[PDB]
Amino acid sequence: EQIGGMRTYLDLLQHVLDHGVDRGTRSVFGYQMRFDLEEGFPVLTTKHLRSIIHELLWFLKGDTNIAYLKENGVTIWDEWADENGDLGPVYGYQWRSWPAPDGRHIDQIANLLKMLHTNPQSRRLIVSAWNPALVDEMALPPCHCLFQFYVANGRLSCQLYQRSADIFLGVPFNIASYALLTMMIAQVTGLKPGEFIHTLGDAHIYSNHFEQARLQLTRTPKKLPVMHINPDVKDLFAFRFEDFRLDG
Amino acid sequence: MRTYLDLLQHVLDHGVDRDDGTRSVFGYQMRFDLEEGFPVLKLHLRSIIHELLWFLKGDTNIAYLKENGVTIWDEWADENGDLGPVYGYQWRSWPAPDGRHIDQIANLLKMLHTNPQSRRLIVSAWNPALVDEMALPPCHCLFQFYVANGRLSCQLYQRSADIFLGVPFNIASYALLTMMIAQVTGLKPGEFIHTLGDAHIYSNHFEQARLQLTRTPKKLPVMHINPDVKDLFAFRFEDFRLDG
Structure with missing residues (x-):
């Protein structure tokens, strides 16, 4: 009975191969995975972490300019940058500066942190990047x-709603990122990591990966490495790359 | 409806007790194949139907509901019968930064016709600028729609879910919406996927929920929809009949 993060991901991989409807992609609509962050850091790649952490710090700064990423050798957003390196109203802007009609900006992240301190049992610990006015x-x-948070037994859980997920090339990165964010937020709020719950809308795999996805379905799952986070950081916006260390 | 009972059972057996008292889990997902019948899991649908039709009209005034003896929203209405920026307003009139209003429903219907394979068939009622x-x-x-093999599916993200008093109604409402949209877009009903955040049951409901786990599950009724309706916004209460 192989049970763990890799298996849960491998189960998704397998479900979409067997029941997915092609359209190359192959897809299902609606999926949900749970990862116990206490078991280890959900590295679900058979095979960079640098991109993951820097991207996440980049999100949290509210930056939508590719420059900080390029400065730290992160290229994942290059192909969408305009002449000035701007991306438009992507995650950082939505998270830190959600534009209200009256010109105010809603710092959803700071609001989440305040709400986690004052009302951890709140049922609206929510950050949205989906703005109908800008999409x-x-x-x-x-x-x-x-994504939404939840606090029970001193543990912080996070559920992400992801409308579109390339299960082979995207989802492992997606998972690592929000698991890391959950861990960072748990730390600064004095909570232990709970679960990351990954909910998918269109969960798909392209036809050029149909065969590869099977190379992973037989693979023996390795022990999850531990993500070590500098325990002194109490300001979510003050994290640095060096604050993180993953085994191996 | 086994899927629903499994929900009650899972939360009752594995949920965590927190006093505000509820027992809760975080993150749950149920699928309902709408071709198997209308997922009504006795519950009074008239309020669900009127409320949905009311959402679809986009008005924040309770007048349509009052006129139809639907009381769901009474406690929240002001002297004039106005509510805040509730569902109908966010769905039909999402307030854009620049001062425009986004009709997410009209845009949805457009997108379903023009790009049925879209991965952003989304309607949101979550506005950080308003909440x-x-x-x-x-x-x-x-909520998000999806089209495969001539079928329309819908996934709802529900942040807070009273699994005992609320969820059955929530399921009915979105199942019905999916069927209405499928009809007017030339599609068959697919599945309704219900994703829950804080899925809770209040302690005063524990035993009634336990008792519901015993009930032998019956064939689902069929929701009959006036097949002559071709415009989502032309549906009226009389166009729906739950039989069987």
């Missing part, structure tokens, strides 16, 4: 629409 |  004008509307 | 001033922030945050 039509984005070349790449946010795939990670909305 | 902190609302007396009742929307529990139904966001």
Whole structure:
């Protein structure tokens, strides 16, 4: 009985191969995975972490300019940058500066942190990157629409709603990122990591990966490495790359 | 409806007790194949139907509901019968930064015709610019549609779910919406996927929920929809009949 993060991901891989409907992609609509963050850091790649951490710090700064990423050798957002390196209203902007009609900006992250301190049992510990007023004008509307937190038994859990998920090339990165974010938020709120719950809308695999996805279905799952986070950081916005260390 | 009972059973057996008392889990997902019948899991549908039709009209005034003896929203209405920026307003009139209003429903219907394979067939009722001033922030945050093999599926993200008193109604409402949309877009009903955040049951309901686990599950009724309706916004209460 192989049970763990890799298996849960491998189960998704397998479900979409067996029951997915092609359209190359192959897809299902609606899926949900749970990862116990206490078991280890959900590295679900057979095979960079640098991109993951820097991207996440980049999100949290509210930056939508590719420069900080390029400065730290992260290229994942290059192909969407305009002449000035701007991306438009992507995650950082939505998270830190959600534009209200009256010109105010809603710092959803700071609001979440305040709400976690004052009302951890709240049922609206929510950050949304899905803004109907802006998605039509984005070349790449946010795939990670909305995420919600929950606090029970001193543990912080996070559920992500992801409208579109390439299960083979995207989902492992997606998982690592929000698991890391959950861990960072748990730390600064004095909570232990709970679960990351990954909910998928269109969960798909392209036809050029149909055969590879099977190379993973037989693979023996390795022990999850531990993500070590500098325990002194109490300000979510003050994290640095060096604050993180993953086994191996 | 086994799927629903499994929900009650899972939360009752594995949920955590927190006093505000509820027992809860975080993150749950149920699938209902709408071709198997209408997922009504006795419950009074008239309020569900009127409320949905009311959402579809986009008005925040309770007048249509009052006129039809539907009381769901009474406690939240002001002297004039106005509510805040509730579902109908966010769905039909999402307030854009620049001062425009986004008809997410009209845009949805457009997109279903023009790009049925779209991965962003989304309607959101979760507005960070509004939620902190609302007396009742929307529990139904966001829903997404999906088209495969001539079938329309819908996934709802519900942040807070009273599994005993609320969920059955929530399922009915979105199942019905999916069927209405499928009809007017030339599609067959697919599945309704219900994703829950904080899925809870209040302690005063523990035993009634336990008792519901015993009930022998019956064939689902069929929701008959006036086949002559070709415009989502032309549906009226009389166009729906639950039989069987």
